[PDB]
Amino acid sequence: PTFKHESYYATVNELTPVGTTIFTGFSGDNGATGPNGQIEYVIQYNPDDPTSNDTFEIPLMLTGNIVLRKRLNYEDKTRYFVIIQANDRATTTTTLTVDVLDGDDLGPMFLPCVLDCRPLTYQAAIPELRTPEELNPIIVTPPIQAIDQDRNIQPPSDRPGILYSILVGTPEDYPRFFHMHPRTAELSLLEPVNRDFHQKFDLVIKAEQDNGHPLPAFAGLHIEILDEN
Ligand SMILES: [Ca+2]
Ligand SMILES: [Ca+2]
Ligand SMILES: [Ca+2]
Numbered sequence: 201p202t203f204k205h206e207s208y209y210a211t212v213n214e215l216t217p218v219g220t221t222i223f224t225g226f227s228g229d230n231g232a233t234g235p236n237g238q239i240e241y242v243i244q245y246n247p248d249d250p251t252s253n254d255t256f257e258i259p260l261m262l263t264g265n266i267v268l269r270k271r272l273n274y275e276d277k278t279r280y281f282v283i284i285q286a287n288d289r290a291t292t293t294t295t296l297t298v299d300v301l302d303g304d305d306l307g308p309m310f311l312p313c314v315l316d317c318r319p320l321t322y323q324a325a326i327p328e329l330r331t332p333e334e335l336n337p338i339i340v341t342p343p344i345q346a347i348d349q350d351r352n353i354q355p356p357s358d359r360p361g362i363l364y365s366i367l368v369g370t371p372e373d374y375p376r377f378f379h380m381h382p383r384t385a386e387l388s389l390l391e392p393v394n395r396d397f398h399q400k401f402d403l404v405i406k407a408e409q410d411n412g413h414p415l416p417a418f419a420g421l422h423i424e425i426l427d428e429n
Contacts, residue, residue, distance in 0.1 A: 201286055364382055
């Protein structure tokens with residue numbers, strides 16, 4: 201018997217449940233062969249990839265459909281090589297390469313991340329007794345920014361947006377003075393500040409995915425009110 205292509209390829213999102221049929225590429229005589237309906241397919245141990253035959257399974261020898269037996273993880277292993285035996289009841293093998301696709305199992309992280317990430321506290325300073333027109337937008341060091349820890353969601357159209365907010369802060373009148381744009385994390389002064397009533401603000405900034413699976417990250421934001429001096 202003789203496989204019809206030199207190689208076969210398949211892709212699988214890591215969120216794919218066990219039980220799912222993940223390859224059907226032998227359908228329509230595309231497997232190994234006048235076809236007789238007597239060629240049966242089996243998965244084999246691969247010295248090069250010992251886990252591969254534990255992870256994939258062929259329930260129906262005649263059909264050759266590969267089903268997923270164990271969960272996958274894009275963040276751990278991204279490529280498998282499955283050896284498929286094809287015997288006639290009247291042997292050859294081929295190699296299926298299964299690539300794992302990145303699924304949405306992680307939320308954002310604030311930048312810069314320095315290894316996981318150390319606690320990040322952003323810095324901003326506000327001169328007292330000046331108008332918002334003079335100061336806006338407030339410069340933050342380093343610039344507030346978060347990215348999805350899922351580094352390779354495909355296509356990009358599937359990628360979630362990121363929403364930024366102020367979860368909490370002290371003193372608690374921060375919302376009088378500060379607004380954060382949900383989509384740009386831009387920070388605006390709303391009113392002038394007098395240092396004799398307000399010296400500093402410690403806020404917790406939140407980044408969440410906008411796709412119903414928030415998985416939020418958090419980061420500090422320390423704002424000093426600078427003395428007119
Ligand atoms: Ca994963
Ligand atoms: Ca992922
Ligand atoms: Ca994600």
